[PDB]
Amino acid sequence: KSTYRTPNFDDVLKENNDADKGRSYAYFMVGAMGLLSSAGAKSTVETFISSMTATADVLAMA
Amino acid sequence: GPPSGKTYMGWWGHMGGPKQKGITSYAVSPYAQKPLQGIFHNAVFNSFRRFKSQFLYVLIPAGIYWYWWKNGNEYNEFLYSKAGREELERVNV
Amino acid sequence: MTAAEHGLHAPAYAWSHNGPFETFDHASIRRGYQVYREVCAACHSLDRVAWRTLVGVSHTNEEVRNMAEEFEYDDEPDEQGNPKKRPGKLSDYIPGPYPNEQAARAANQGALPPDLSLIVKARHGGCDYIFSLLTGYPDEPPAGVALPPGSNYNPYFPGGSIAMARVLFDDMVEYEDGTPATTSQMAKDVTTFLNWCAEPEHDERKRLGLKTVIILSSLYLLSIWVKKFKWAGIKTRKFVFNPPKP
Amino acid sequence: QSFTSIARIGDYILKSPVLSKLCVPVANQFINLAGYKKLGLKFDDLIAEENPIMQTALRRLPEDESYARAYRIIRAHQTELTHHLLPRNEWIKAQEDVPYLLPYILEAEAAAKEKDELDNIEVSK
Amino acid sequence: MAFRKSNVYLSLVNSYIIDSPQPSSINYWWNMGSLLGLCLVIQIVTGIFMAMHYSSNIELAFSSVEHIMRDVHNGYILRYLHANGASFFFMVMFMHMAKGLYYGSYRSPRVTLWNVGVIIFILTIATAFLGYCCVYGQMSHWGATVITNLFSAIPFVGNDIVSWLWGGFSVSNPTIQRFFALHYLVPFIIAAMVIMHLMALHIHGSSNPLGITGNLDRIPMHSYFIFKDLVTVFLFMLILALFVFYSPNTLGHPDNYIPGNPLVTPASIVPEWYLLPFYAILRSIPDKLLGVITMFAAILVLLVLPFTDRSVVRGNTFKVLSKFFFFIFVFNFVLLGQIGACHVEVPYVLMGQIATFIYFAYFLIIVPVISTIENVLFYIGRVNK
Amino acid sequence: MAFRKSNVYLSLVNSYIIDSPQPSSINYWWNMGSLLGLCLVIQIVTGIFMAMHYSSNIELAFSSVEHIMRDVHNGYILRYLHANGASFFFMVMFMHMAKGLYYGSYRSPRVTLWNVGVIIFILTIATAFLGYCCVYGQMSHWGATVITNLFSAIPFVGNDIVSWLWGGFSVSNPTIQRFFALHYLVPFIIAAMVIMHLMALHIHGSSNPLGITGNLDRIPMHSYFIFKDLVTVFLFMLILALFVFYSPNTLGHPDNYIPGNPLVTPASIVPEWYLLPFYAILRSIPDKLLGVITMFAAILVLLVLPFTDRSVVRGNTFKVLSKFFFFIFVFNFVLLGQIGACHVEVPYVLMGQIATFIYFAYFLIIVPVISTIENVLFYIGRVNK
Amino acid sequence: SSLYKTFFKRNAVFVGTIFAGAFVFQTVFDTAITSWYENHNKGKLWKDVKARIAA
Numbered sequence A: 001k002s003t004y005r006t007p008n009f010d011d012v013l014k015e016n017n018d019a020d021k022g023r024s025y026a027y028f029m030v031g032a033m034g035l036l037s038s039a040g041a042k043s044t045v046e047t048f049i050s051s052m053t054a055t056a057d058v059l060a061m062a
Numbered sequence B: 001g002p003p004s005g006k007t008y009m010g011w012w013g014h015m016g017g018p019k020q021k022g023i024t025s026y027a028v029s030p031y032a033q034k035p036l037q038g039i040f041h042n043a044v045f046n047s048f049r050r051f052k053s054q055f056l057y058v059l060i061p062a063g064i065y066w067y068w069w070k071n072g073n074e075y076n077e078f079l080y081s082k083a084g085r086e087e088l089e090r091v092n093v
Numbered sequence C: 001m002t003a004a005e006h007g008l009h010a011p012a013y014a015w016s017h018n019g020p021f022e023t024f025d026h027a028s029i030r031r032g033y034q035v036y037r038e039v040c041a042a043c044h045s046l047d048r049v050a051w052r053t054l055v056g057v058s059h060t061n062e063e064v065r066n067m068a069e070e071f072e073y074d075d076e077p078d079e080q081g082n083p084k085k086r087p088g089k090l091s092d093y094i095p096g097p098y099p100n101e102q103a104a105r106a107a108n109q110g111a112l113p114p115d116l117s118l119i120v121k122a123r124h125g126g127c128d129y130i131f132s133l134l135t136g137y138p139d140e141p142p143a144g145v146a147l148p149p150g151s152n153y154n155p156y157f158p159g160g161s162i163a164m165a166r167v168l169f170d171d172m173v174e175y176e177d178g179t180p181a182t183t184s185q186m187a188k189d190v191t192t193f194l195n196w197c198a199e200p201e202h203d204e205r206k207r208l209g210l211k212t213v214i215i216l217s218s219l220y221l222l223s224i225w226v227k228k229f230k231w232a233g234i235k236t237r238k239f240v241f242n243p244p245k246p
Numbered sequence D: 001q002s003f004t005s006i007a008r009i010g011d012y013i014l015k016s017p018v019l020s021k022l023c024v025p026v027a028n029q030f031i032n033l034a035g036y037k038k039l040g041l042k043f044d045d046l047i048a049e050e051n052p053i054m055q056t057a058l059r060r061l062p063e064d065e066s067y068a069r070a071y072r073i074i075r076a077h078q079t080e081l082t083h084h085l086l087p088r089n090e091w092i093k094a095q096e097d098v099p100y101l102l103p104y105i106l107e108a109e110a111a112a113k114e115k116d117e118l119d120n121i122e123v124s125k
Numbered sequence E, F: 001m002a003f004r005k006s007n008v009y010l011s012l013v014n015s016y017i018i019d020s021p022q023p024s025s026i027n028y029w030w031n032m033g034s035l036l037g038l039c040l041v042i043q044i045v046t047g048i049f050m051a052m053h054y055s056s057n058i059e060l061a062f063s064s065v066e067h068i069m070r071d072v073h074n075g076y077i078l079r080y081l082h083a084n085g086a087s088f089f090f091m092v093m094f095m096h097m098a099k100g101l102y103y104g105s106y107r108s109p110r111v112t113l114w115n116v117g118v119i120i121f122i123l124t125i126a127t128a129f130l131g132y133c134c135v136y137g138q139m140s141h142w143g144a145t146v147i148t149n150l151f152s153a154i155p156f157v158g159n160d161i162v163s164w165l166w167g168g169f170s171v172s173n174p175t176i177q178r179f180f181a182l183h184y185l186v187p188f189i190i191a192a193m194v195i196m197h198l199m200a201l202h203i204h205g206s207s208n209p210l211g212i213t214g215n216l217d218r219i220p221m222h223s224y225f226i227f228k229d230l231v232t233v234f235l236f237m238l239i240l241a242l243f244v245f246y247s248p249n250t251l252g253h254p255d256n257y258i259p260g261n262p263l264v265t266p267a268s269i270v271p272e273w274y275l276l277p278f279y280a281i282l283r284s285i286p287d288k289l290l291g292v293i294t295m296f297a298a299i300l301v302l303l304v305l306p307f308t309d310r311s312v313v314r315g316n317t318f319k320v321l322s323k324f325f326f327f328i329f330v331f332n333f334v335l336l337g338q339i340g341a342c343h344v345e346v347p348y349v350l351m352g353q354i355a356t357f358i359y360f361a362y363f364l365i366i367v368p369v370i371s372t373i374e375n376v377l378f379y380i381g382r383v384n385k
Numbered sequence G: 001s002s003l004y005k006t007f008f009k010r011n012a013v014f015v016g017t018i019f020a021g022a023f024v025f026q027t028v029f030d031t032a033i034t035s036w037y038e039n040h041n042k043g044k045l046w047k048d049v050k051a052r053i054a055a
């Protein structure tokens, strides 16, 4: 078999209808994963930091 | 830097494998492939492949142990019921 | 282990707080406090519960303030060094009935009524067990069972022999909201109140759980899609061998 | 376990009509159930190589077979990573599942054994 | 060259997490290691933040955990994360170890990797023990009591070691305070041990599901595996979240919600689930000394596997008999755990004794016998004479 | 290859402690590093053992240290070693840093080495501060108050950070307990930084008193420097033992033998001796914010040395003007410390302000001017054109 | 998808936007969840019971 004859990738390739179909999907997916990871990270950092603030039992305004 | 020992793995450019000749490989950019739909086309279709090929190696020992457990569990239940106090006095002390 | 020793399994009642999306019924919490105060408090403490925690949950600031002010607490000694008392405040903890373990056992034939602040989490069965115990005292023990002088039979209690006698009887309390105070209704109410004592974070815990699980579920599916994309080139990589010429 | 030892026991069984009629069928069954042929590998491709005997053997293996081994290995990792099997027409057939490395392994093992014996010989004056 | 390769610090990050050559075919079972790293970090971070509101004094210990549950903002999240986190830490370590058993990861040249791992397992169990004691509930007191007494089985100096560990006449104030001190220490030793684990892993790289060389087709750690690990990181978090917020106490024991009492051992006493199999092993030997020895040997026997496996190939992928017995072993391990959760009663006692023998026989008999048989089977199933 | 070089773990020990090529001419000043390692180990070990008898509760802290002092066998030795050990740690660190300024150890290619060092210095100071707070004497309380309040200078979020560090209205229970938790944590962070420190040292090796290349004549770390370091180790232990057994409280403050009182700052309040120079710098500025900034800049300006040293040769060995001004710097630092122990009074206030100026002028003005001048002196003093 | 292109045009979303989006998401998501949660539990919350208890 000649190395110049590229094997069949038809079942994997998409018809050139929108070359950016995959890109946009991939970028939205990455973008959303990063958005939610950032929200999650901020919430986690805040959860720990806030646990160091005055506990419920020492806020007595006697 | 000091000389450390030889191992069976190296690094990029001298990994430690045999010389490779005659193999040609091809690949296509993920950006040029159908926006991932193989999650419910060749994953759910080809699903249970890893199942029906290996399940017996897991199911038989699983079944053997489950039966042994249920059998011993029921025997215990009987031994501690009114109907089993006679056999309980025997097998115990 | 014999059935008696095990104790009867407690059935699953439909607590309105059973379920990932359910808060406690606060009206039931409020009613439960009354049952605790009028029926249980005389023998059982609630040492880890501070008055201020009832506020915004089952009573208003005023209602709790007034409830607390009915009890005395050790104050700071006067200028001369003599001890002095003071009315309780929101920062104080619900006062117990006994000064020490000895006084408690004396008022209960040698037995010690445990603190109930964690009773719901300190027993297998949770609410179902507490409820079943409170409403599970038969009029007489089963035939053949000899009961230790001073004991009471309850199938749900391991061994069957418990130092606490049945205390819940129809209409021994008069609910403020006009609810018929039947034994089971009162049992349902205190158990709910006791669950709050043990898990005051319940409502808030579940709310954050919904948030956390939706974010992570999304994050999980997202990560799979992203992974498949970054691996697409490798997953479809093709190989061909052409035996080299010697 | 050394291949010399495996061969000694295996040859013994293979020469005995009684044992051979009893064991070989079970062994054939075992190899088909093993499934490595469905991945396109020959048994000798499965031998753990991180030891001096195998390194010696793989060094001595002729160029052409060495390139062939490399292909079967690479093709297998790829197939395995995709969670598929190769099409049947690419499966190694029983006729092809030949012990190509074995002779090199036995040779290397015998040399090391002799070297070990000679390193520890006693002398009788 | 790139700054990530030339910089003294970044080059370490680069070699272990970025350019590290991974076998192209390692499956999801190879994601357990990164997960154990997450666990350690989760455990340490949550522990430190809780440590800020905890009191080791035997009289304030239990209430200070209650103080974290009730008064500390997000305190119940910290505690449930820590407590449930410990459980997940063990479930993941069990899978990581099982992955090792199944794929012959313990085999040469990865013996040191395996041995350091056995070290980590022991430190992790000791750490978990010490942490549980700090709560000072009924299970804590009696667990501290039973486990410290394990050393009383050492002849002659046995009882002195126990008095030394206790720092008194029984588990008391000095015992809880040092246990908390030690609980804080060991996680840092484990981390040190993890680094050694990774150093051994690095000189040989990871193995693969085929059990053969990965040298012919490696793909960089960065991107492929950094993102593949993220998948399991999120699934681990999702499941831990399900337990933490929706079922935070199903993996624990209600008795630990009752303050420790030196005069009463609850009839309902049961060790933490992850310790149950070892507990069952010890309980199977009707002799004090022989009982502790066998239980400890149950962990140490993991060290003999590199020598009892006679197979000429690494891993169980192509071995029918080995695959079958591997699952017998796994299921025997679960049964040992279930036995541990039962009472010392007739059917269960014999079953435990039988399961205990099956546990040791796997490493000492079944593995070496079956592997030898498979070597011959692969040979006679093809070679002609 | 020798097993010490081939083994994955021993090869690290061998390259850092055995075969490491050391410049043949390094003198005893290069023995401070190993001494600092000894200090860290002394602090960690003595600390862990005391932690076993300590109670961070504000109501129990002071008494728990007294319990260690009276009731714990050899407990006074632990505390006196830990306490005096802290001071020695700082005296040896000051000499280690001074050694650096003198021999130009901060310059290329060792700036990363120096910067990590500055990081370690800060971490150690914070650790020592947290430790002092755990005794909860009169100095502990007020030290905690002043130092946490240092952050109230940050605009807008200032008072919020303080409230967060305190965990309440003032230095109280939540503060002492978290400070103990963090006191236990930072020393492990320092250990990790020390590894980064040693990593950066290793790729370039040590410098020498001649300030020139050591590549033409290296001698192995083992025997030579292993035994030379032993000399200073014993000396260090001898002097430290003298204080621990014969003068345990000379380096301390009597006021810290008095339980913390939230309503009374003693008129005799003085910071721990090793912090005095920095304290004097802060007092020299009649403005709150500028005071804390200048004090922090006093530590950060150490990072500027690699750029302000314009000299073409490394070290002061052959530099008359630099050698002189270096000692002006050392004694000025000592004086700043003396001013620190004095009351805010007339002669002292001006002296502190001028000394503070000299401290900064050294790095920003003196070094660059003097080094430039010497560059030209070395040139015209021989070049005949 | 043109919906994506109109906003980012073949470029991946930048950090700043990601972070900015995370801040908007926290507020909006919290409100939506609390809202759904409280409504699902109408009649059980203290604020609902406080309204009932008027005598």
Ligand SMILES: CCCCCCCCCCC(=O)OC[C@H](COP(=O)(O)OC[C@H](O)COP(=O)(O)OC[C@@H](COC(=O)CC)OC(=O)CCC)OC(=O)CCC
Residues within 6 Å of the ligand: B043, C224, C227, C228, D083, E026, E027, E028, E029, E031, E088, E091, E092, E231, E232, E235, E236, E239
């Ligand atoms: C109580 C405490 C528990 C804490 C532990 C939580 C983490 C669990 C880890 C699970 C694990 O290690 O299982 C590994 C096995 C091996 O699997 P394999 O041969 O490598 O995979 C081939 C993939 O489909 C390739 O496929 P893929 O393209 O990479 O996507 C795979 C799949 C991965 O899903 C996961 O999250 C992995 C478990 O994504 C999906 O399609 C799922 C959509 C809902 O995966 C299985 O077979 C799972 C059954 C055991």
Ligand SMILES: CCCCCCCCCCC(=O)OC[C@H](COP(=O)(O)OC[C@H](O)COP(=O)(O)OC[C@@H](COC(=O)CC)OC(=O)CCC)OC(=O)CCC
Residues within 6 Å of the ligand: F026, F027, F028, F029, F031, F088, F091, F092, F231, F232, F235, F236, F239
């Ligand atoms: C302070 C509280 C905490 C600190 C406690 C630890 C103290 C250690 C720090 C001191 C230090 O680093 O001093 C370094 C200087 C520089 O010295 P050098 O130029 O390199 O030495 C040439 C050697 O004599 C060669 O000679 P040698 O053959 O190595 O023996 C040297 C000498 C070493 O003594 C020591 O203990 C080292 C300080 O032993 C003796 O003969 C005298 C015994 C008293 O040593 C000095 O002589 C100081 C000069 C001012």
Ligand SMILES: CCCCCCCCCCCCCCCCCC(=O)OC[C@H](COP(=O)(O)OCCN)OC(=O)CCCCCCCCCCCCC
Residues within 6 Å of the ligand: B054, B058, D080, E029, E094, E095, E097, E098, E099, E102, E209, E299, E316, E317, E330, E333, E334
């Ligand atoms: C001190 C010693 C401790 C050690 C004890 C062991 C730990 C306890 C066990 C916990 C779970 C571990 C399960 C086994 C570990 C994973 C096994 C594995 O690696 O399986 C790989 C296998 C199929 O993979 P293959 O690569 O071989 O497929 C061939 C492709 N050509 O995949 C399969 O066959 C499918 C996997 C089936 C898993 C079912 C596990 C059942 C576990 C019970 C759960 C416990 C809860 C009570």
Ligand SMILES: CCCCCCCCCCCCCCCCCC(=O)OC[C@H](COP(=O)(O)OCCN)OC(=O)CCCCCCCCCCCCC
Residues within 6 Å of the ligand: F029, F094, F095, F097, F098, F099, F102, F209, F299, F316, F317, F318, F330, F333, F334
């Ligand atoms: C944040 C800021 C950090 C910096 C703070 C600095 C604080 C000061 C540190 C305290 C001790 C000072 C250590 C002195 C610094 C190193 C001294 C040194 O290296 O001196 C070398 C010098 C001669 O050495 P040569 O290598 O140049 O000899 C070449 C022969 N051809 O040999 C000499 O000069 C003789 C030795 C001089 C002894 C030092 C005396 C000063 C002692 C201070 C007393 C402490 C008071 C409590």
Ligand code: HEM
Residues within 6 Å of the ligand: C035, C036, C039, C040, C041, C042, C043, C044, C108, C111, C112, C113, C114, C119, C123, C130, C133, C161, C162, C163, C164, C165, C167, C168, C190
């Ligand atoms: C409705 C109000 C009450 C509630 C909710 C309640 C609840 C409980 C519960 C849950 C237990 C734990 C049993 C166990 O170990 O599982 C208990 C024990 C006990 N209670 Fe009560 N109780 C109430 C009223 C009383 C009264 C009025 C008294 C005192 C006369 C009393 C005396 C005791 C005693 C002595 C025990 C010990 C049981 C034993 O160990 O045998 N209780 N109670």
Ligand code: HEM
Residues within 6 Å of the ligand: E029, E030, E031, E032, E033, E034, E036, E037, E040, E093, E096, E097, E100, E103, E104, E105, E106, E110, E113, E114, E116, E117, E118, E120, E121, E190, E194, E197, E201, E205, E206, E207, E208, E302
């Ligand atoms: C804190 C616990 C541990 C950590 C962080 C850890 C981490 C890791 C990591 C990151 C890997 C590489 C990826 C993988 O295969 O998952 C690995 C591999 C390995 N670990 Fe661990 N490990 C731990 C405990 C253990 C234990 C207890 C054992 C054994 C008793 C063990 C045995 C192994 C082996 C044998 C490998 C190589 C697997 C292979 O490549 O086939 N590890 N570990």
Ligand code: HEM
Residues within 6 Å of the ligand: E040, E043, E044, E045, E046, E047, E048, E049, E050, E051, E054, E065, E079, E082, E083, E086, E089, E124, E127, E128, E129, E130, E131, E132, E133, E134, E135, E183, E184, E187, E190, E252
């Ligand atoms: C490998 C890491 C760790 C493991 C496996 C571990 C495990 C445990 C376990 C099993 C418990 C009892 C859980 C319960 O039922 O409540 C516990 C408690 C505790 N741990 Fe850890 N721990 C780890 C690290 C840490 C660290 C580094 C600290 C100290 C800074 C810490 C501080 C505590 C505290 C304060 C408690 C008491 C509060 C509680 O009950 O959760 N832990 N730990």
Ligand code: HEM
Residues within 6 Å of the ligand: F029, F030, F031, F032, F033, F034, F036, F037, F040, F093, F096, F097, F100, F103, F104, F105, F106, F110, F113, F114, F116, F117, F118, F120, F121, F194, F197, F201, F205, F206, F207, F208, F302
């Ligand atoms: C716990 C803290 C520290 C430890 C354990 C440590 C340890 C060491 C060691 C073992 C050496 C080699 C031998 C020697 O020169 O004494 C060294 C060199 C060095 N260290 Fe440190 N160090 C510490 C802190 C610092 C600090 C605070 C600085 C500077 C602000 C620093 C600056 C240096 C420099 C510049 C060198 C190279 C000196 C030369 O070769 O000329 N170190 N250190």
Ligand code: HEM
Residues within 6 Å of the ligand: F039, F040, F043, F044, F045, F046, F047, F048, F050, F051, F054, F065, F078, F079, F082, F083, F086, F089, F124, F127, F128, F129, F130, F131, F132, F133, F134, F135, F183, F184, F187, F252
């Ligand atoms: C490695 C650097 C360390 C330094 C510089 C250091 C420094 C200090 C200082 C200045 C004090 C006050 C001494 C006094 O006047 O009484 C102190 C106290 C204390 N430190 Fe550390 N420490 C270190 C590490 C540790 C570690 C790892 C622990 C472990 C928990 C620890 C535990 C304690 C305890 C319990 C006290 C209070 C008892 C006492 O006064 O000695 N320290 N530390």
Ligand SMILES: CCCCCCCCCCCCCCC(=O)O[C@H](COC(=O)CCCCCCCCCCCC)COP(=O)(O)O
Residues within 6 Å of the ligand: A030, A033, A034, A037, E034, E037, E038, E041, E226, E227, E229, E230, E233
């Ligand atoms: C102790 C071990 C704990 C965790 C082990 C897990 C290992 C994975 C770490 C993930 C880092 C991802 C960085 C990707 C990167 O830099 O590539 C950057 C791209 O990064 C992105 O697109 C950001 C996507 C959002 C990342 C999600 C954060 C993960 C949540 C953290 C949870 C972990 C505790 C290079 O991109 P480019 O190659 O296309 O030019």
Ligand SMILES: CCCCCCCCCCCCCCCCCC(=O)O[C@H](COC(=O)CCCCCC)COP(=O)(O)OCCN
Residues within 6 Å of the ligand: E111, E112, E115, E116, E192, E195, E196, F006, F007, F008, F009, F010, F012, F013
């Ligand atoms: C924060 C950590 C900083 C960095 C950590 C690395 C520092 C290393 C300091 C440790 C010095 C102790 C090394 C002793 C190990 C030497 C022997 C050895 O490695 O034998 C190993 C086996 O070791 C084990 O089974 C146990 C590991 C010991 C765990 C120690 C806690 C043999 O390995 P070998 O090098 O001989 O491999 C080739 C032979 N086919």
Ligand SMILES: CCCCCCCCCCCCCC(=O)O[C@H](COC(=O)CCCCCCCCCCC)COP(=O)(O)O
Residues within 6 Å of the ligand: A037, A039, A040, A041, A043, A044, A045, A047, C208, C211, C212, C215, C216, E041, E042, E045, E077, E237, E238, E240, E241, E244
């Ligand atoms: C240090 C790692 C600890 C994280 C362990 C994760 C296990 C699941 C429980 C997480 C809950 C903690 C906070 C919480 O309750 O938030 C909840 C939201 O949680 C999430 O979104 C969790 C997803 C996790 C993403 C984490 C990214 C990685 C961490 C980076 C840290 C720099 C509630 O949020 P909230 O307080 O309402 O603002």
Ligand SMILES: C/C=C(C)/C=C/C=C/[C@H](OC)[C@@H](C)[C@@H](OC)[C@@H](C)CCc1oc2c(O)c(OC)cc(OC)c2c(=O)c1C
Residues within 6 Å of the ligand: E122, E125, E126, E129, E139, E140, E142, E143, E144, E146, E147, E148, E165, E182, E269, E270, E271, E272, E275, E278, E279, E282, E295, E296
């Ligand atoms: C200062 C540090 C010290 C003393 C460290 C000691 C470490 C010991 C071992 O770790 C290496 C040990 C934890 C490990 O044994 C190998 C476990 C499997 C022990 C398993 C174990 O648990 C129990 C438990 O949890 C209980 O709870 C209420 C009660 C128990 O009996 C009633 C047991 C028990 O009978 C056993 C065998």
Ligand SMILES: C/C=C(C)/C=C/C=C/[C@H](OC)[C@@H](C)[C@@H](OC)[C@@H](C)CCc1oc2c(O)c(OC)cc(OC)c2c(=O)c1C
Residues within 6 Å of the ligand: F122, F123, F125, F126, F129, F139, F140, F142, F143, F144, F146, F147, F148, F165, F182, F269, F270, F271, F272, F275, F278, F279, F282, F295, F296, F299
């Ligand atoms: C959770 C951890 C936290 C909040 C850590 C904070 C760390 C801050 C800094 O470390 C980097 C800080 C310790 C360091 O500043 C650079 C020192 C030189 C501060 C010097 C210092 O000491 C004093 C002291 O010791 C006292 O004792 C009785 C009393 C003091 O006034 C009366 C002072 C004082 O006026 C100053 C400036």
Ligand SMILES: OC[C@H]1O[C@@](CO)(O[C@H]2O[C@H](CO)[C@@H](O)[C@H](O)[C@H]2O)[C@@H](O)[C@@H]1O
Residues within 6 Å of the ligand: C137, C138, C139, C140, C141, C147, C148, C149, C150, C151, C152, C153, C165, C166
């Ligand atoms: O404390 C109650 C008291 O009642 C006795 C009377 O003989 O027991 C009978 O009555 C109890 C209350 O109705 C039952 O709980 C008990 O089961 C029944 O036998 C005493 O035994 C007991 O001390």
